Amino acid sequence: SLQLWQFLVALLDDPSNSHFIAWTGRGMEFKLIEPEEVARRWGIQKNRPAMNYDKLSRSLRYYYEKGIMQKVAGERYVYKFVCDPEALFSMAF
Amino acid sequence: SLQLWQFLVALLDDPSNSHFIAWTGRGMEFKLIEPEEVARRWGIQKNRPAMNYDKLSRSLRYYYEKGIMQKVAGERYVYKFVCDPEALFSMAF
């Protein structure tokens, strides 16, 4: 049972997925190029066929509160993993 | 069962442990202020009473290979957690 952040890291590690999700090249920044495709694959992963970006974005919002991620200012689908002791702790536990 | 990197993160998060292990304030860098005390507490955690800094340093060496941590060049007891997609993937999986 993967957490959504783990699942995104696994998709980001394969450049074959770069058409729907990719590291932008700027540090730990990544873009949901096809956000509905990212949702569909998350749906397959968790056996939730009714998964959509609306549900996926609520999960990405929870990740700001934990300090794991931040939404890049001025962007609809660009986020970054945070590299600080708080993010590390939330990812470790 | 905690991994050594998780154990260090847990010790680092609690300022009660700051007399023997602490974040330096420079990004993800941390210092083993009392390296033998870190080693003794790792021993308590894993029920390995014969734990010492020698055994700990070799396990830290294994984490450099994984790509999760690195020893700060020119320092005896200063390390850092790595901020890159490879580190994130190794910590996630």
Author numbering:
A (entry chain B), B (entry chain A): 334 to 426
Show passages lifted from the paper.
Crystals were obtained from constructs that contained the Ets domain, Etv1 (encompassing amino acids 326–429), Etv4 (encompassing amino acids 338–470), and Fev (encompassing amino acids 42–141). The construct of Etv1 included two inadvertent mutations that resulted from primer impurities as follows: Y329S at the N terminus, and P427S at the C terminus; this construct is denoted Etv1Y329S-P427S. Our attempts to crystallize the corresponding construct with the wild-type sequence failed, although the mutated residues are in disordered regions or at the end of the ordered region of the crystal structures of Etv1, so they are unlikely to have any bearing on the structural and functional analyses. Electron density is observed for residues Ser-334 to Phe-426 (thus excluding the Y329S and P427S mutations) with most side chains visible. We also compared the Etv-1 construct used for crystallization, which contains two primer-induced mutations, against wild-type Etv1 and found no significant difference in DNA binding. Etv1, Etv4, and Fev display the typical fold of the Ets domain, which contains three α-helices (α1–3) flanking a four-stranded β-sheet, with an additional C-terminal helix (α4). On an individual residue level, the most striking transitions can be seen to occur in the recognition helix α3, where in Etv1 Asp-387, Arg-391, and Arg-394 can be seen to become ordered upon DNA binding and Tyr-395, which can be seen to switch between the two alternative rotamers found to be important for recognition of bases downstream of the GGA motif in the Fev-DNA complex. Analysis of the contacts between adjacent molecules in the Etv1, Etv4, and Etv5 crystals reveals a conserved potential dimer interface that is distant from the DNA binding surface and is present in all the DNA-free and DNA-bound crystal forms. Dimerization of Etv1, -4, and -5 is mediated by the homologous cysteine residues (Cys-416, Cys-422, and Cys-449, respectively). The reduced monomeric Etv1 protein bound the DNA probe with an affinity up to 200-fold higher than the oxidized dimeric form; a C416S mutant of Etv1 bound DNA with an affinity similar to the reduced wild-type Etv1 (0.26 nm).
